[PDB]
Amino acid sequence: AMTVLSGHVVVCIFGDVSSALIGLRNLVMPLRASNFHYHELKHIVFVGSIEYLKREWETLHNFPKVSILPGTPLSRADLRAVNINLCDMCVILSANQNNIDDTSLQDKECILASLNIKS
C-alpha cells in the first residue's frame, strides 16, 4: 500500500504445489524489452500462493521491477493493497487448468476474480 504503484501491472495466479509450472519468464520478457526506456518500464506484482511462487521463483529472479504478494487473488484487501484501480492491466492466470476435469472448476477461479474486480 505504501509502495505507490500507478499505471503498473498486477498478475493474478491460481497456483499451488499440485499445479503444473506455467512459466512466466516468457510473459515478463517483452515487458523488459529495450524498445522503451527504464523509466518507461512498468512494475509487475504477482498475487497468489507463496508455494507456487516458491516453485517458480528459481526461474523468477533475474528480472527488475518485479514484486510478489503472497496471499489470494480473490482477496479484496490484497487487491486494494496492490491498487488494481491504478493498475494498467490485471492478468488473471490459472495453473490448475490442466489437472481439473470439469467445467465447474474450468476457469471457475478466473471468472470469480474477474467478477470481484468488476464489483
Binding site: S75, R76, A77, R80
Partner: protein
Amino acid sequence: ELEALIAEENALRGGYSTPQTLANRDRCRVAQLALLDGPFADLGDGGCYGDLFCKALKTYNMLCFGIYRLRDAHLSTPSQCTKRYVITNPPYEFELVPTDLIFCLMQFD
C-alpha cells in the same frame, strides 16, 4: 455493514467505542431461566400460562417462548430422568410444574 466489512477484511477488528457504538448492546438477549426459584417463581403450580407470560410482560417485558419441561415431569411415577424436552408456543390453559426451565427473552443489556 458487518457483512461488507467481512467481505473487505476477512477478519473482525476492534474499534474505539462511541455512544452510537455503545448503542450496539441493544440486542434483546436470549436466555433460559428457571421456574422453581426466582422473582417469577411466585407461581409454579398454576395452569395459567397466559397469566404467567402476562406477568412476565408487566414485570420486565420478558417474552416467553416455550416450556422446557422434563420428559417424566408429566408423570405421577417419579423417575430420575433429567432429560428435558422443548414445547413451542404453549397455550393459555397449559399447566406448570415448579421443576421447570423456561425459554425467555429479557430486554437488551
